[PDB]
Nucleic acid binder design. Structure first.
Lengths: 68, 83, 198, 77
RNA sequence: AUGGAGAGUUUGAUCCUGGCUCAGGAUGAACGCUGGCGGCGUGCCUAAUACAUGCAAGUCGAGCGAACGUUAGCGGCGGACGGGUGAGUAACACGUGGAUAACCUACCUAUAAGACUGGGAUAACUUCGGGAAACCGUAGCUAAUACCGGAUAAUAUAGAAAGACACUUAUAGAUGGAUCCGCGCUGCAUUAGCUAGUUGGUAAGGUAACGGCUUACCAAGGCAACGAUGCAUAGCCGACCUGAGAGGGUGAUCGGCCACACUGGAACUGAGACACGGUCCAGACUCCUACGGGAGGCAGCAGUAGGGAAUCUUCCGCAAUGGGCGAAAGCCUGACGGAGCAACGCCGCGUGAGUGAUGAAGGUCUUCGGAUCGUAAAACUCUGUUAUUAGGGAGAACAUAUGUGCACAUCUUGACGUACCUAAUCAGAAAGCCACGGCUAACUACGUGCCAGCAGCCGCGGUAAUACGUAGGUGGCAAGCGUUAUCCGGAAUUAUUGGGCGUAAAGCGCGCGUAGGCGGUUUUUUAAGUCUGAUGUGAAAGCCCACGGCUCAACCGUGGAGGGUCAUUGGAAACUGGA
């Protein structure tokens, strides 16, 4: 991230960003009993939004295309 | 130049002016030499012209007039017709 | 203001007082999910919150919109315990529930235009009207005889106290002082007189 | 726009020729010289009159400083 | 006392201390968005982010020289005041009092004051060699209520230049600052100390003041625990949540003050600075370029660039409220006002049913058993509260022949001009997203089947996960909803109400010794003391006993009531540790 900091981040969900060397908002939240990664990654945020497969969220996980 | 400036103090967009012997170099919140109670132009209560210029009688002899153009406000305070 | 079914007020709450028969064609058991199971026992703070939710479906103004209602049933001097049933009958639903316009409170809030509204001068299309000793909650000149205003003119004979209603008039202007015990008593009084204070 | 000389003029009254201020300092340099030499300049204290035809007629000195020398003088006689 | 206080967590259930994973409101907010209409307010919160700008505020003869009341430009006159951002004083700097044998008090307008006394003269006018501008030369001048000290009043007892049919010594009316103490201020164990004219002495001066300011000299381990002395570094306050009170918080506002003005540093006649756009000096910056130069507010406004899950237009006017100029008149103003601004909270007039066919044309679960998304419903009537053009019009209130002692006359306004509303009664739409086995008010069919989803607490996925994903849904609440960092319900959790002197949360093995923290001494004391006493004052974005309306919003008088006062002994001694 910024301020020369390195953390074992992880993207929670099914979102598979295909844009390397790009800024990615750090999801405000830690993991639950997961030795190794101790942080999450916000979906989208000036990067690969995600997939339109899911539609039960329509709030987070880079949701879009409101069904009618 | 030292008249009865209306000290504009209180809340925002509703200053509670209080006629007091102030200078022209110090507008609004400056320096009161002879305070004269306070004027209430709320027009919703009885006590309105509650000015106490009992010690302001010496001010009206060498530097005393109207600061915020208050002729009717000073009209109630009739302390003339004696010179 | 709730924009929902007005039949769950006598299921989620324990004090509806809005209709005679409601559990006749329904199921007067417990809640919804565990409706075929046993009932529970209202908690100390829960009983005061249940009454608030019970009056939430009864009173038109909900959380924050009924500020005056709660403010008049707390800081106001007098029987604080019975201040929720004393200083809370100053709405426009009471006039319709005393003259014979609307049997419910939600319909009484919408009866401030279709029914009598002109309270001897300036009217009000809100859920609460300023009816004091001198105000005659009547109809207008063009809306003198309405359909919802003269609906139960003979169906609603018995009228409430501190209220007036006649044929081709329905103008309320009787006593201004009301009763603090002339309302349903199912919720606690000191409980809401302390919880509200907080 | 308006030259200030009634408000914060502490340095505004201290920014021009000082020749007249230095010339007045040389005239008040005999303060103790004339007193130690018994000059006639400080003679006749009925006037210094020095309050009826001096301060306004022609005067250009300090305030408190002059007042100190304006106390013993103009009053001694 | 409007009178807090859920669990799990440990055997296979457990009590009990203990800590938070976790039943809520708050969230100067943004946020993926489904963000009908709006009164009001905040908006580089991420940013003392760099720099092209529109840009501080102009004038005056009752007193003087254009061609024609001031028209010649001198003189009276805010550049520091409106302002802007708050890195900067861990502290009278501000917050907070009497004050001043620490005290100055310049100053602002009235009267004494007789326009007196030495005056030449002054910018303009303009004799004017040249210079790219980057500056010398040729120089005479003319004014103005611009303007010059000694003898006759003020701590003695050594007055003038001129006002219409202005005035000056004394001083008043008035006026700004320096000060005493009583008040806000971190801890280090992985530092345990600091001042030496530290502590007091009087004399060379001069400023708001004594003066350890220096003055002649003055101590030892003394000062200091009052962590003085190191740091922490912050603009301070009037404030809003808060336990139910006992506890606890204690600043965004909006005004006072305290600051700052590329960087420093030293000085500069007229009336109170270091000067937001005067000096000089230096330093690294700004840019064009005649070789020399100019330098920078953008720390006045709005912008280009900064990275902000997280924020105002390079728009009109001085309506008005201002003050400074200025016999009036004239005249000044990104002070200030009005329009762009986003769900920034708008919660309501808030969008159609008086009526009403199993209200279906057949589907929502369907072992189809009925009910129904369904007193949904047709197609109208209904409900008015959408347009259709409309002419519309309190902070701060008195004036202007010359007829008028803090009173006032022929003659002094607009940057505007569509709340609640029962009325025209066109038809302008409260949707939504979430838990659904739940915990915790909530579900049916398929599709999945440790693939993926779900995923605070639970967990549900290796087959029958209504926990998953679609459809019919359901509980909640409200023009929306899931998210991120910030107080308190949660619960006392350095225990303070809220800790043991043993398993819990607890045996200093240290047996020999005064940290003044604290451990009967009779009587006995001169009054440490419990409840009476100067009371005027008794004020307060203060809970004001009421006090005003804006329907949903900001419309504010009551200093005696009124507490949030400002009578609680001078005093009645056989008595914490010390007899």
């Amino acid at each position: 991230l910024s301020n020369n900091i390195e953390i074992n981040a992880y993207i929670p969900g099914i979102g598979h960003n295909l844009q390397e060397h790009s800024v990615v908002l750090v999801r405000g939240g830690r993991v639950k009993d997961l030795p190794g990664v101790r942080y999450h990654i916000v979906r989208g945020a000036l990067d690969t939004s995600g997939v339109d497969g899911r539609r039960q969220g329509r709030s987070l996980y880079g949701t879009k295309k409101p069904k009618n | 130049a030292v008249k009865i400036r209306l000290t504009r103090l209180g809340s925002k967009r509703n200053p509670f002016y209080r006629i007091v012997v102030a200078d022209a170099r110090s507008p609004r919140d400056g320096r009161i030499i002879e305070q004269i109670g306070t004027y209430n132009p709320t027009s919703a209560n009885a006590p309105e012209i509650k000015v106490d210029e009992a010690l302001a009688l010496k001010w009206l002899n060498d530097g005393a007039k109207p600061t915020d153009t208050v002729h009717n406000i000073l009209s109630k305070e009739g302390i003339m017709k004696k010179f | 203001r709730f924009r929902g079914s007005n039949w769950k007020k006598s299921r989620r709450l324990g004090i509806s007082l809005s209709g005679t028969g409601k559990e006749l064609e329904k199921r007067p058991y417990a809640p919804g999910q565990h409706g075929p199971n046993q009932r529970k026992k209202l908690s100390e703070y829960g009983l005061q919150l249940r009454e608030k939710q019970k009056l939430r479906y009864l009173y038109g103004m909900t959380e924050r919109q009924f500020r005056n209602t709660f403010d008049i049933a707390g800081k106001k001097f007098g029987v604080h315990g019975e201040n929720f049933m004393i200083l809370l009958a100053s709405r426009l639903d009471a006039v319709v529930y005393s003259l014979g316009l609307a049997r419910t409170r939600r319909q009484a809030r919408q009866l401030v235009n279709h029914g009598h509204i002109l309270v001897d001068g300036k009217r009000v299309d809100i859920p609460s009207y300023s009816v004091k000793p001198g105000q005659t909650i009547s109809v207008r000149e063009k809306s003198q005889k309405l359909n919802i205003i003269v609906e139960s003119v003979e169906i609603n004979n018995f009228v409430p106290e501190y209220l007036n209603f006649d044929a081709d008039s329905l103008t309320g202007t009787f006593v201004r002082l009301p009763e603090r015990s002339e309302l349903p008593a199912e919720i606690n009084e000191q409980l809401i007189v302390e919880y509200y204070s907080r | 726009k308006s030259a200030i000389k009634r408000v914060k003029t502490t340095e505004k009254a201290e920014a021009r020729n000082i020749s007249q201020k230095s010339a007045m300092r040389t005239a008040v340099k005999n303060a103790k010289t004339a007193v130690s030499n018994n000059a006639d300049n400080k003679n006749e204290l009925v006037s210094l009159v020095k309050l009826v035809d001096k301060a306004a007629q022609s005067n250009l000195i300090h305030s408190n400083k002059a007042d100190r020398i304006k106390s013993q003088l103009m009053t001694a006689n």
